Amino acid sequence: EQTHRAIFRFVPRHEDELELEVDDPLLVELQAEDYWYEAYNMRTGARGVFPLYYAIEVT
Amino acid sequence: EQTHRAIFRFVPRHEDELELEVDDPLLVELQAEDYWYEAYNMRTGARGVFPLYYAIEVT
């Protein structure tokens, strides 16, 4: 189920990054490593990393 | 003359990235490209890109 939500537009520049649109639903299985999250984007079905401060926890 | 200030810690994972600490003063000369800024970090003297929402504009 959805763990996080994207809060800022993120356009990948690098080959391991996950594209985000504001309010995109995210599934984060693991703890952040060195201020990056690894996520499955539930709108786009893509997987990848994004910066720690671009998503919040959902309740 | 400083144009922006970092408000969140940004730990590079990629070779072209700029390391930010909270409060670093930044010189942004160029237009953002796909919501990344290119900057000179006035604390460290380092250059590179970081995601646009990690900094505020200073007047």
Numbering used by the authors:
A (entry chain BBB), B (entry chain AAA): 490 to 548
Describing publication, verbatim:
Aromatic residues cluster in the core of folded proteins, where they stabilize the structure through multiple interactions. NMR studies in the 1970s demonstrated that aromatic side chains can undergo ring flips—that is, 180° rotations of the χ2 dihedral angle (Cβ–Cγ axis)—even when engaged in stabilizing interactions in the hydrophobic core. Our data therefore suggest that the conformation of the aromatic ring at position 526 is determined by steric interactions dictated by the size of the surrounding amino acids.
Accordingly, we designed four different mutants of JIP1-SH3 (H493A, V517A, V517L and A541L) and obtained their high-resolution structures by X-ray crystallography. Of note, three mutants (H493A, V517A and A541L) induce a staggered conformation of Y526, with χ2 dihedral angles ranging from −41° to −75°, whereas V517L shows an eclipsed conformation of Y526 and an almost identical structure to the wild-type protein. At the same time, the side chains of L519, Q520 and E522 and D523 undergo large-scale movements to accommodate the flipped ring within the pocket. Thus, all mutants—including A541L, which stabilizes Y526 in a staggered conformation by a different mechanism—share the same initial structural trajectory and report on identical breathing motions.
